[PDB]
Design an enzyme around this catalytic site. Structure first.
Site, PDB file in Angstrom:
ATOM      1  N   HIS A  73       7.110   4.225 -13.956  1.00  0.00           N
ATOM      2  CA  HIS A  73       6.340   3.047 -13.475  1.00  0.00           C
ATOM      3  C   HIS A  73       6.010   2.190 -14.718  1.00  0.00           C
ATOM      4  CE1 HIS A  73       4.132   0.613 -10.602  1.00  0.00           C
ATOM      5  NE2 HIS A  73       3.132   0.569 -11.464  1.00  0.00           N
ATOM      6  N   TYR A  86      -7.499  10.453 -27.357  1.00  0.00           N
ATOM      7  CA  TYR A  86      -8.387  11.614 -27.629  1.00  0.00           C
ATOM      8  C   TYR A  86      -8.203  12.822 -26.678  1.00  0.00           C
ATOM      9  CZ  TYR A  86     -10.681   8.142 -30.612  1.00  0.00           C
ATOM     10  OH  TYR A  86     -10.934   7.194 -31.582  1.00  0.00           O
ATOM     11  N   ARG A 126       0.855  -1.206   0.000  1.00  0.00           N
ATOM     12  CA  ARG A 126       0.000   0.000   0.000  1.00  0.00           C
ATOM     13  C   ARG A 126       0.887   1.252   0.000  1.00  0.00           C
ATOM     14  NH1 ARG A 126      -3.869  -0.091   2.651  1.00  0.00           N
ATOM     15  NH2 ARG A 126      -3.945  -1.914   4.060  1.00  0.00           N
TER      16      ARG A 126
HETATM   17 CL   LIG Z   1      -3.845   2.997   2.208  1.00  0.00          CL
END
Ligand SMILES: [Cl-]
Ligand SMILES: [Cl-]
Ligand code: NA
Ligand code: NA
Lengths: 457, 457
Positions: free
Chosen positions: A48, A93, A2
């Site tokens: 990334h 787009y 996380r």
């Molecule tokens: Cl979190």
């Protein structure tokens, strides 16, 4: 696995990379919009390396003014709508450039303010934490689908938060209540009201944990109730399903019909039509607030990453004192960085002056010597750096050299050098500069409170 | 919405963009490998803005020597294996640079040889057709999952095709049989045999349409049959399923066991173990060729896009005569392009010489004139271009100016200029240059035939 936001600039890696990528592509607020794909492509290739979807979703969120309290991306095309933030067109787009507010995070990047870290393959460098000029952590908070996240920080008003920083700079021991004389509470991107009592808002800032309760705002026009603003991220369409469901269960005999009249320019306009002008409106709405999303709640858990790299449940005081420590450290490096460029520049002028004063001979040495660089060094007692800079001089640049322009720039730099040493020479002078910039920046990037706080405003 | 290869460089848009993207990132054969994502990111952002998967799949195919007869990408990491070309690792792990052979398509790009076309958003330009130095259309053909494609062109040997081009340059009316004295037929990336008769191979080149039939190659060692090479794109594992299925149906009482002994370095080694050393090997294999993928067929339909932009079912002669027309046009622009740079350079030297011959005065004019550029133009009768170039001259570059180096380079360029006008002045001299380059290039990039043609070799 996380991600937690960093106190410094309030960003998670996903977010930080998208903005850095965009300022590197030169997509600032003065540049022309460029197809979103270009940006996604860079983030995917350099920072990334997973996918086009992950990145672009986080990017679309930054361009939505109903998602971010202070948007980081200015978007053209279909960047989704309020009742369904997922109705955004493909990246081939849509077009994007940075926000004006983005300057708060990026204007100081090239000025020795960032701790650089290798990217995923060690070929380029990326910022660990952006040099934010205002505490974006509180200003924008944690944006997006909040049910997945453990850490929740609601948004705040830029001007209120800036004033609280000023307060800490003036009164370093100012208690949290005192900080709350300026920060009324959260400030969401909606005209809806925060109805949490002031006493509970205060405990939430003292604790770092709590709850915010917002309520839709309504008015009456021609006997029909018109809801003009909904709580943060509440779907107007979902609210109608909820009211309609109650109508099916015979719980709303006073409600006749419902209509979603929101259009292009008017994002929220839900009309609840009462059975008659004899229906008690305030009694009906109280019931709807207690039984529908017209009154929704939000969690708070300011468990973020500090300057020491470790997480902490930070209360408002702890957070701002630490952010000010980050800000002063940042400004200190920005000044140190400049001082170095001033001193390198003075070294070049000291050399360039000598060369101008002995120019006839310098040009002779340059045209008639086996080793020109090594001859100027021995003759005029120049450092190698000075000698290279002289030899790099073009003939057009040789035409513009004037002794007074060289001594004039040399004066300016010697006084700018004195200013910088005075600022770095005491904490007291930094503080006033930080304070001065907090105030200008607040004027430049700030806006009025949107979500009123019933307990105060 | 089907893509057809272009006669010029034998590529489809997908492919052309990946290679152009890579040469623009400076990922040539001398550069260090860079994570595949970087390349995918560029293609996605600048040329084909749809997805990471579409692009990377086509890219992996170019790096597989068992897919492309002449690979365009040199890859490090897991770029799939022979029996399952789909077992490639993600793009964040694999690394890629261009092939040595890629030079055939790209070395002439920056030399006025390409027709530039706007990319998808009109912000950059991309090549319409790469300036291929050899007919990659026949060399690599149409690579990938062929069942979806309407157009099929098998691969060929570079040296055989080059020799056929030489033949057309010498004998412009050389018939297709005569071209087949050099081009034996297709040349796949496998030691397996092409068993189509020479008479049918000939009709296929006369027609543009036909069929190729290949056959696995085997040897016997210690009584066991060892298949050492399979037909193009045939799965060794699938062949074992097929033989095993026949064993279940009591059709192979002479077969005892099967073993896949292919390893890291030995891509194909399928061992068919007979029941005894008394089993007729050639009779068994004839049966397996007729009943399994050990003998597979391939379609031919050379319906490609020509120089006039429209498709055509092109026979071998039609195709090569047209490719030679593309090649000579390309070389003509490459020479024209160079001639222009030589002539601009002569114009600068003509100006630089005058400045060197009157250098004392030039430096005086530069140091003491309100308008230096406009003064040199009036004094020494110089063009603006010459005047700028003089004024751009640095002091280090002023030290190295020597009258003989200026007249020496001026001589070289005047003779290189004469050579270029002679080549552009007649078709006969171009032809020999084209012929000369076809032969060097064939020596440089070519290799021995891999798939033997039983009807000839
Ligand atoms: Cl979190
Ligand atoms: Cl096709
Ligand atoms: Na949450
Ligand atoms: Na086919």
């Amino acid at each position: 696995d996380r991600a937690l936001p960093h106190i410094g600039d309030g960003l998670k890696p996903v977010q930080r990379r998208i903005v850095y990528a965009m300022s590197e592509l030169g997509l600032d607020a003065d540049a022309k919009h460029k197809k979103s794909a270009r940006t996604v492509g860079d983030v995917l290739g350099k920072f990334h390396p997973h996918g086009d979807s992950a990145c672009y979703e986080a990017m679309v969120l930054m361009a939505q003014p109903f998602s971010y309290r202070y948007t980081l991306v200015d978007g053209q095309g279909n960047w989704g709508a309020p009742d369904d933030p997922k109705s955004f067109a493909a990246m081939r787009y849509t077009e994007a450039r940075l926000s004006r507010y983005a300057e708060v995070l990026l204007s100081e990047v090239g000025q020795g303010t960032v701790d650089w870290v290798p990217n995923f393959d060690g070929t380029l460098q990326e910022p660990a934490v952006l040099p934010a000029r205002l505490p974006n952590i509180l200003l924008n908070g944690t944006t997006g689908i909040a049910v997945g996240m453990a850490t929740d920080v609601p948004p705040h008003n830029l001007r209120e938060v800036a004033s609280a920083c000023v307060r800490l700079l003036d009164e370093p021991k100012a208690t949290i209540e005192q900080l709350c004389e300026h920060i009324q509470g959260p400030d969401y991107p909606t005209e809806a009201e925060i109805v949490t009592p002031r006493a509970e808002i205060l405990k939430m800032y003292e604790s770092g944990r709590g709850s915010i309760r917002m309520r839709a705002v309504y008015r009456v026009e021609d006997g029909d109730i018109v809801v003009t603003a909904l709580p943060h991220q509440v779907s107007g369409a979902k609210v109608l399903e909820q009211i309609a469901a109650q109508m099916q269960a015979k719980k709303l005999p006073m409600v006749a019909d419902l209509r979603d009249e929101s259009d292009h320019e008017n994002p929220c306009r839900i009309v609840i039509i009462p059975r008659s002008n004899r229906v008690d409106v305030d009694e009906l709405m109280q019931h709807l607030f207690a039984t529908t999303d017209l009154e929704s709640t939000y969690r708070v858990n300011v468990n973020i990453i500090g300057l020491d790299g470790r997480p902490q449940l930070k209360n408002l005081r702890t957070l701002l004192v630490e952010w000010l420590e980050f800000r002063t450290n940042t400004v200190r490096r920005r000044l140190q960085h400049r001082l170095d460029k001033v001193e390198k520049r003075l070294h070049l002028l000291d050399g360039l002056l000598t060369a101008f004063l002995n120019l006839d001979e310098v040009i002779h040495i340059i045209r008639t010597e086996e080793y020109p660089k090594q001859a100027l060094i021995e003759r005029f007692e120049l450092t190698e750096i000075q000698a290279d800079y002289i030899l790099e001089t073009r003939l057009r640049q040789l035409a513009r050299l004037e002794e007074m322009k060289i001594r004039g720039e040399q004066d300016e730099l010697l006084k700018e050098q004195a200013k910088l040493q005075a600022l770095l020479g005491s904490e007291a002078k930094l503080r006033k500069l930080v304070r001065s910039e907090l105030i200008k920046d607040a004027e430049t990037y700030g806006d009025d409170r949107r979500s009123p706080i019933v307990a105060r405003a």
